[PDB]
Amino acid sequence: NLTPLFEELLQQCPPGGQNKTAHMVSAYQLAQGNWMPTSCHVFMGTISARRTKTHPYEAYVKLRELVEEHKMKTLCGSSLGKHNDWIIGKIKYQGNLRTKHMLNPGKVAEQLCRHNVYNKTIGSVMTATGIRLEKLPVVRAQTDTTNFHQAIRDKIDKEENLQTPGLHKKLMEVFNALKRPELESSYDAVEWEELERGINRKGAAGFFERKNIGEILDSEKNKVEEIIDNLKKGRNIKYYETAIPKNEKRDVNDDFVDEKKPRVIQYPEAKTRLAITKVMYKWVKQKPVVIPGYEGKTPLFQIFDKVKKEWDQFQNPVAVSFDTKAWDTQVTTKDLELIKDIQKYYFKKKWHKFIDTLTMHMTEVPVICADGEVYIRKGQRGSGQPDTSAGNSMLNVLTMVYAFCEATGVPYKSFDRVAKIHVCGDDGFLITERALGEKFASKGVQILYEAGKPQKITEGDKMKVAYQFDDIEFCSHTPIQVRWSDNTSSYMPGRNTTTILAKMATRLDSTIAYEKAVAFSFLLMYSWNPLIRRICLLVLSTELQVKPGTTYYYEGDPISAYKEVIGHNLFDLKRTSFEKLAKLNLSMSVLGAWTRHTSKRLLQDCVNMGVKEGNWLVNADRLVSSKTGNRYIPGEGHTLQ
């Protein structure tokens, strides 16, 4: 009766270990009365209790008393580490972050250095069909300095999560169930050439740097090699991260979902990022993949077909979603230490002192904000570290297998026999049989809280379950089935039409070639969406002399290029799933972004252009060509990046 009240309190208790000595009672037994909490330390949703016949509300006031007693004797003195001392010398002005859990030593001197504009061609195409641009959500919000420091105080300014005693030994036992011993002690640094192939030269400079990635490559390689040398020998470097709001000028990726970035971007200097990537390439880029389920290298237009083939081998498949609240701030020092031990498993012994020193620097990180304010972060992850994707994915896989096995009784070495997991940093889900998944979905919240990865406050304290394939959510997307004219069916990455329109029509800048790279990219993703697909085809049909400039672009003909990645011709897309299309279209009607005329004014504009003589891309749309009589004859075309 009082059970859900206790379930909520137990997610405020400090995690503890087993007891045996004392009777260990759950939130159920507590609300049944006649149990008195001896301690507030929780182990698997149990607490210790003396059978002294209490009132259920006396028990609750007791446990709550024990917890608040604990919380005030625990919020207490962070001595700065010698290797971070150098940042104090650069301090010039008093701090004003008002942080309650990490040092704010002050503010350094300001240093010597983008708004949301429309893509005019793409935007005018939408305006031309009655899509009302003013009703579309804002998709690239820039935070001002005051809400930025608020985001720091709100999300970063925290003490490290308590975790179950012995957790990381258990996680290490999960790792040993899925290591790849044929790769142990084999990873070595890579050559400049391999590094330079896969690296964005626009990659951002840190607070004290001036040159970006490409400029350091061109003229300051010796500075990167010196950092490698220091770390390799175990000497300290002047390691620091810079903090910027999401969608700031320096918010640039070194390598369609961009919602997978936190509000505060924290990133090491470009010299330092190159140093880490040169040595740890094979691990941070996952070449080869050793993280089970890792999908960070699978294209979004492929991922759901791959998952479908696994869903299809279960009697009663369900998927349980991982939804950790602000994952990067929940990463603890013991978590980083676990990743370090795993890296050292795969790396040759000559890089172990490198790995150790890097990790030490990452456990207490000086962070400089854009405005110069300094804070000292304990643990956590900066979203811009080269290890973010690989470290987070591995950490997520271990913690989720741990939680599932503790929850269901399945032993770690038996996970691969009853469940399939997929991860992209903190994002992911596992597929398994309905009984197993429902048992994991109810208990996972409390176990994952005690493992130091609290889940987003869900409905009834259960994790989200998908009972049908296309209710799965992953990388901001969800499966939508399409029908091909060869009588096959496949799945594409679905997402709300309102969100696709806003992403397509807007840009941060400080050219039609870029708009056609966007249109081709969105065509690769969203050709299941008749409205997106037709706008793409029109924009691509604009100024055909101009080559395209941006996750993907096409050499030669975009329609051929499409046929290469997707494996069908655009013209063979017969049908999109009726129900899932209606779901993904609802916010068009809720926001008033379209009207009853919009779908036909768009089709008409395509027919109007496609009946004309020539070779028109719009005629690659099955239904447009149906009404023009003309077809599109492709040239020779290839997808690149």
Numbering used by the authors: 13 to 88, 90 to 126, 131 to 272, 278 to 532, 538 to 576, 579 to 670
Paper text:
Compared to the RdRPs of other Flaviviridae representatives such as the NS5 of the Japanese encephalitis virus (JEV) and dengue virus (DENV) in the Flavivirus genus and the NS5B of the hepatitis C virus (HCV) of the Hepacivirus genus, the pestivirus NS5B contains a unique ∼90-residue N-terminal domain (NTD) that does not have notable sequence homology to any other viral or host proteins. The global conformation of our CSFV NS5B structures is consistent with the recently reported CSFV structure with an RMSD value of 0.9 Å (95% coverage) between the reported structure and our representative C-682 structure. These structures together reveal that the NTD adopts a globular α/β fold with an α-β-α-β-β-α pattern. The NTD interacts with the palm of the RdRP core intra-molecularly with a mixture of hydrophobic and hydrogen bonding interactions. Collectively, these biochemical data indicated that the RNA synthesis fidelity of CSFV NS5B is fine-tuned by its NTD through the intra-molecular interactions with the RdRP palm.
In order to investigate the function of the NTD of CSFV NS5B, we first made an NS5B construct comprising residues 1–694 with only the C-terminal hydrophobic region removed. For description purpose, we herein named this construct as the wild-type (WT). This construct was soluble and capable in GG dinucleotide driven RNA synthesis using a template RNA sequence derived from the RdRP assays established in the HCV NS5B and the JEV NS5 (53,58). The structure of the WT was solved at 2.5 Å resolution in space group P43212 by molecular replacement using a BVDV NS5B structure comprising residues 91–672 as the search model. The structures of the C-682 and C-672 were solved at 2.1 and 2.3 Å resolution, respectively, in the same crystal form by molecular replacement using the structure of the WT as the search model. These three structures, each containing one NS5B molecule in the crystallographic asymmetric unit, are highly similar with root mean square deviation (RMSD) values of 0.4–0.6 Å between the WT and two C-terminal truncation mutants for all superimposable α-carbon atoms with 99% coverage of the resolved residues in the structure of the WT. In the structures of the WT and C-682, residues beyond 672 are disordered. Although this conformation is likely not compatible with de novo initiation, normal activity of the WT and C-682 observed in the polymerase assays suggests that the canonical conformation also exist in solution and may be in equilibrium with the observed bent conformation observed in the crystal structures. In a time course reaction, WT NS5B exhibited low level of misincorporation with the mismatch fraction gradually increasing over time and reached about 0.25 at the 180-min time point. Lying in the heart of this NTD–RdRP interface, are two adjacent RdRP residues Y471 and E472.
